[PDB]
Paper text:
The recombinant MacQ protein exhibited bifunctional acylase activity against various ranges of AHLs and against multiple β-lactam antibiotics, including penicillin G, ampicillin, and amoxicillin. The MacQ protein is comprised of 806 amino acid residues, including an N-terminal signal peptide, and belongs to the N-terminal nucleophile (Ntn) hydrolase superfamily. AHL-acylase is one of the enzymes capable of inactivating AHLs via hydrolysis of the amide bond of the acyl side-chain to produce homoserine lactone (HSL) and fatty acid. The MacQ structure clearly revealed a typical Ntn-hydrolase fold comprised of a four-layered α-β-β-α motif45 mainly composed of two polypeptide chains, α- and β-chains, generated by self-cleaving activity.
On the basis of the previous reports regarding CA, we created an SP-shortened MacQ by deleting seven residues from Val20SP to Val26SP (from Val203 to Val209). Unexpectedly, SDS-PAGE analysis showed that the purified SPΔ7 was uncleaved and was present as a single polypeptide chain with a subunit weight of approximately 80 kDa, suggesting that the seven-residue deletion of the SP inactivated the self-cleaving maturation, despite the fact that SPΔ7 possesses the catalytic serine (Ser1β in the cleaved form). Interestingly, SPΔ7 exhibited unambiguous degrading activity against almost all of the substrates tested for wild-type MacQ. We successfully determined the crystal structure of MacQ SPΔ7 in ligand-free form. However, each molecule was determined to be a homodimer composed of two uncleaved SPΔ7 polypeptides. The overall structure of SPΔ7 superimposed very well on that of the wild-type enzyme without its SP region. We could build the continuous atomic model for chain A, while several residues corresponding to the SP region of the wild-type enzyme were disordered for the chain B, and most of the residues of the SP region (residue 179–200) were disordered for chains C and D. The conformation of the SP region of the SPΔ7 (residue 183–202) was found to be completely different from that of the SP in the wild-type enzyme. The structure of SPΔ7 indicates a possible mechanism of the autoproteolytic cleavage between Gly202 and Ser203. In the SPΔ7 structure, the ~3.4 Å distance between the main-chain O of Gly202 and the main-chain amide of Val272 would be too distant to form a hydrogen bond. However, the pocket is insulated from the solvent because of the presence of the uncleaved polypeptide chain (residues Leu201-Ser203).
Numbering used by the authors:
A (entry chain C): 8 to 179, 199 to 777
B (entry chain D): 12 to 178, 199 to 777
The structure:
């Protein structure tokens, strides 16, 4: 025995943020896995059942996943087949074989640290009372952590079709997030300013966990990871800061297979039979009466990827004697993402950040924006792993059956898998086979700003639109932007023009911290006045043959100033109204590429009757909820912690909020509670800059670090977010040890 | 001209007084809408198949009911296909004139309230200005009436019927106590349907007084115009769900190349097509048409059985149809009408046998002057013989028999497999009257949703057709074991209540007692097995069960408002793996006390289940020893009223069964609870005339603004039965009496 031991120093500061300090990558993984489990054991333990495909054994085949995530909530039995079949032992082998030694070590360490905590939770104590005595709270392996890492890569492709892939048998969605990078012409200062605002889960294993990793001599990085991931995915170090938003670029396509007659598990490749590769999978499943029964399916792969049951999309697309369909996710063969975040965690300049992004071409389903100490310009890119097809292919390769989806999935290549000419293409500068070459993926540097709110790359900067990149990246000058995108660029322009009501005309760290929470509602700012002019005089109506007294609703909305702040009165009536306004023929001024933030616009006077119908419904729904029409938003929109409803602000992107606090709960069922599993919402937030004293970051983790109701870090951060009080997260050693709430413990064990 | 006098008393209970059946229907339609417009209006979309047009084809039904909660588009197809214009015509053609009049009046009175809601007011604010609040026709009321009949057969397969293309009903207690049991001049009838707290199948309590014709009080589903469970001056009765199957399947042998024709003794028969178009609203607010062609066989509608088992797909060679006996039963509403007017128990029984129409429930009744109480599962039931079941069940039919025992699954290509008609069958293909179970007893009859076998445990019933359910071969539910136990212990005087007779006053207390059979019988053996020591290792984890052991030992096995720890027992018992739990098997000689005997081998599994129960309670925020009324509650006017009772699965008789997981704010009754205490009645016939005490647990009105949305619920929480006035003098002398007359030209 070589005596190797993991040893990590865990320093926790305010909100319980852990700052792991270790002499090597293994020990850093050991500390990070320990603190993730210490704060989120129940969410994590359940999640490892998902990636191993062991949910059904413990929790019953017919129950749904407990937590929402990039997988959604399929039945346990289908989730188990999906994971076993796509994240097979081969896919894990393949993934691990492409990894640098230091990351294989960090992941072994992470598993050991998770397991150390599991031993502590089994031993005793009051933490994680909700699950600590369950059989599925158990040690895991490094391989399990690689399953989880691989799983994260599939959000843009295979994950969205878990049930469809688990049920492909022979006859025998992703959305959200804002970010800005302001360059030094915008901040007026020696460095740019980075605003990171992923809209994401508040519960479940995809949710973020905030921490710092200090790996002596190699990295000192702070930010967030999904639970179960060992490197920082959105964050900063002494030299660079970055964030991500969902990209419009499709990451998957379909291949239609022409089957061998007599033999529906074989397909033709330029006239030659090729066998599909079978996998007979048995998933053990707990019966409602307590016993366990085996469930066996034989599922299949083609050379493109797994077989996929498309009959749910359209019954014509069943796997028949003549045709079957496969799905290819470009990320299924992309083993490079984890190393890419790793290299960014260690990056010493924006130029280096940029080179890593180009060399790896691995970013799986997101845009990236970054700012680097000493660099005048901010960076925007949708440089990652993306299917490569030419327009010639889209014309010659698309099949009749593909139409049946052509509205449901535009830009997704649905190709004739019979013809090798239809396989995805490889460029001279493609990093991976069948992926777009680096020079053909969009990016921009600007010394004013770049931003993205989940529209295409086109308007990274409104003054310098980007065009001429492959169609798969999304439209470039021909589609209207969403209301959130129009809100997000409007706020950026108004800041630099000094016309948004905040101090000065620079995107300083302090003013950015305020602006990003201001909760303006674009649909109300641009359209509420026209709507009221159109329907509020008279305010006594006939709607569906009923007398409707809209005088109070008209008054409340006229007095409301189009913001969803905690004290704003009537903002929820607007949400209930705007969300019901039929969209056909609503606007008289259509989209103009030369005016993309202010078009479409112009409420159609012919829409008057339908607007009164929608308003009358909205007044009824608010009355049914038991809230007053003029209730303050903080009473409607809230997070409960320690028995107290903490008031919140913000709203849904569909209303044209930029500040996102988007409840899944109907107003009539207790308001817009954030306590269940809300829609993608403000989660980890960071405002980062690089002033003379060193990197400075202000952060929130809105739902708080720990999922355990007994933890002091279950609702402390949430109370700060309710109050609008950004956390100045300590980063230097002196900042960490000088923090008012500093505590340090060391964990160690033999490797 | 319709004219009805509406007198309301305490809790808003309306007592409609009218000179004829049309006007009584007008008054009743008006009050039901006045209290429940939003539920009712939403329901008329359902029965007409017009949900998707207003609410989107993709959305599920808003309310639970006998239909369950399928997508709007499937519901709309089922209703249009099964409740066709022809089905409505046929239903109406079989009706007495006075009931056709009454349903015309009910439509007109509902429409009158619709006019008033549209004109102004703040009642029914939740929906008064929506397009789907709109006048209805008498035919629409008939659609609703027919729909209620299909609960035992078609309604359970609505989606499967809506998607049949070529290539769960449970609950309720009742007792009937005879004069030997009451020690008095009359029996005592206890009616306790466990039913919906929201949606159009929920009960609405009222009296109808129709000049020289009827004077009846009780409940109807919303949309129904006669009293379904109730009493009059001479007879009282109630219903519980019957175990008897009301449907079967016919496996069809398809005609070659013709997957919409089938063979009948070798001759092709064409299925009858219906091309149905349903407008459906899209997510952006436009409306687009959906079209399916669906089919009928001579047995009933084609049905998609691929979901039951993939092998049962409508293929080239085979298809499946479903026959619900109640699809051709047009008699049920006339049957309740005739009971509403009956002048004695003998007449009530004679009506039951004459009509043989009761569609999916048992009946128990007590009559004025009658020594013996009455139990029957006499109603409409498919008639197949043993010979025929052996000769006709197809190889597929045998496989499905395991999940669906006694549902005839027959070869529909053979005319000798058609359902039989006996000499005393009232309807073709239905069981004859002399072959359906009944019993009179001067002590008691009772049923809690097991079969007819133990209507009275001292005199079991045997030998009736298999279709009625098992009678000695299956263990009884814990609720049936608790319900009989309670009746025996009452008459033995060993239940703790006054005397040894089932008087109205004592029965009113006993039925709310909230005893928990699983705890009374098994908690001691559980704690003896697992509580010493109370420090455990469970899946390798140290578990401190000392508080759980102490709280359960101190709990007295009742779910009353003050009982501490009863919710920990719910979280535990519901988790106990049932395979091999009991060492004393079911015995037909001792059906109340078997199976029993907790298997010592289950100790690890019992610890696992208890550890998980402790965990779930901790996650909910409640203490292990919380009083039940804090955990189990109904919110009205912003106050959580404490409740008592529980779920049948634990062996409660007093049923208050939340669908809400305890970690989501406790056992709230505010959403759509599982079948629970709803209308309850304890009725007797003292020398002054019929006396009834009642609850409508969720209150009369679905409108949060109504003074009758929470008043009765506050009473139920307090355990204060309502003495419902019945005579003219009681009604006009009630402390809350108000009267108003509604009239209009016909």
């Amino acid at each position: 025995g070589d005596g190797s031991t993991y040893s990590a120093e865990i320093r926790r500061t305010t909100m319980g943020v852990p700052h792991i300090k270790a002499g090597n990558w293994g020990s850093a993984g050991y500390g990070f896995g320990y603190v993730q489990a210490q704060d989120n054991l129940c969410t994590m333990a359940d999640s490892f059942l998902t990636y191993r495909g062991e949910r059904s054994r413990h929790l019953g085949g017919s129950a749904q996943l407990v937590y929402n995530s990039t997988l959604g909530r399929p039945r346990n039995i289908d989730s188990d087949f999906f994971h076993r079949h796509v994240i097979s032992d081969e896919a894990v082998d393949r993934t691990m074989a492409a990894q640098p030694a230091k990351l294989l070590q960090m992941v072994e360490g992470f598993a050991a640290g998770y397991n150390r905590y599991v031993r502590e939770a089994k031993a005793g104590g009051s933490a994680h009372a909700a699950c600590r005595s369950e059989a599925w709270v158990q040690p895991i392996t490094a391989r399990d952590v690689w399953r989880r890492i691989y799983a994260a890569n599939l959000a843009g492709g295979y994950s969205n079709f878990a049930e469809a892939i688990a049920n492909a048998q022979p006859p025998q969605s992703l959305q959200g997030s804002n970010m800005y990078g302001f360059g030094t012409a915008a901040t007026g200062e020696g460095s740019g300013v980075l605003f990171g605002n992923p809209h994401w889960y508040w519960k479940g294993p995809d949710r973020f966990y905030q921490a710092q990793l200090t790996i002596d001599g190699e990295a000192n990085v702070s930010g967030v990871s999904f639970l179960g991931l060992p490197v920082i995915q959105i964050g900063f170090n002494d030299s660079v800061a970055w964030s991500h938003t969902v990209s419009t670029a499709r990451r998957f396509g379909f291949f239609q297979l022409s089957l061998v007659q007599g033999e529906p598990t074989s397909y033709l490749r330029d006239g030659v039979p090729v066998k599909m590769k079978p996998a007979t999978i048995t998933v053990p499943s707990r019966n409602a009466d307590g016993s366990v029964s085996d469930v066996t399916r034989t599922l299949y792969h083609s050379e493109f990827g797994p077989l996929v049951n498309l009959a749910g999309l359209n019954p014509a697309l069943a796997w028949s004697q003549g045709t079957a369909f496969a799905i290819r996710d470009i990320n299924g063969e992309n083993f490079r993402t984890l190393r890419t975040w790793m290299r960014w965690n260690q990056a010493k300049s924006l130029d280096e950040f940029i080179a890593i992004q180009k060399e790896e071409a691995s970013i799986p389903w997101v845009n990236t924006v970054a700012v680097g100490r000493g660099s005048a310009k901010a960076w925007y890119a949708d440089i990652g792993a993306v299917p490569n097809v030419s327009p010639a292919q889209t014309a010659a390769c698309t099949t009749p059956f593909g139409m049946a989806v052509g509205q449901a999935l535009p830009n997704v290549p649905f190709f004739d898998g019979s013809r090798s000419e239809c396989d995805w293409l490889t460029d001279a500068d493609s990093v991976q086979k069948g992926a777009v070459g680096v020079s053909r993926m969009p990016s921009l540097q600007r010394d004013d700003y770049v931003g993205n709110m989940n529209d295409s790359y086109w308007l990274a900067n409104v003054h310098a639109p980007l065009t001429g990149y492959p169609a798969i990246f999304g439209p470039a000058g021909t589609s209207a932007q969403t209301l959130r995108t129009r809100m997000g660029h409007t706020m950026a322009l108004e800041r630099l023009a000094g016309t948004d009501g905040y101090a000065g005309n620079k995107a300083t760290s302090a003013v950015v911290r305020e602006m990003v929470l201001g909760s303006r509602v674009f649909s109300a700012e641009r359209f509420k006045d026209e709507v009221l002019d159109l329907i509020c005089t008279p305010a006594q109506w006939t709607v569906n043959g009923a007398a409707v007294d809209a005088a109070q609703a008209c008054a409340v909305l006229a007095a409301w100033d189009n913001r969803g702040r905690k004290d704003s009165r009537g903002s929820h009536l607007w949400d209930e109204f705007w969300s019901r306004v039929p969209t056909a023929s609503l606007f008289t001024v259509p989209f103009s590429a030369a005016d993309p933030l202010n078009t479409p616009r112009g409420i159609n006077a012919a829409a008057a009757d339908a607007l009164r119908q929608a308003m009358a419904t909205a007044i009824a729904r608010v009355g049914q909820s038991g809230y007053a029409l003029d209730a303050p938003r903080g009473e409607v929109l809230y997070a409960t912690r320690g028995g107290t409803r903490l008031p919140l602000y913000g709203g849904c992107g569909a209303m044209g909020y930029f500040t996102i606090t988007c409840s899944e709960n109907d107003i009539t069922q207790g308001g817009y509670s954030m306590d269940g599993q809300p829609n993608a919402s403000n989660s980890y937030m960071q405002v980062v800059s690089f002033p003379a004293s060193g990197v400075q970051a202000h952060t929130f983790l809105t739902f708080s670090l720990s999922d355990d109701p007994a933890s002091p870090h279950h609702g402390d951060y949430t109370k700060a977010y309710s109050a609008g009080q950004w956390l100045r997260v300590p980063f230097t050693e002196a900042e960490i040890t000088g923090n008012a709430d500093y505590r340090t413990a060391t964990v160690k064990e033999l490797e």
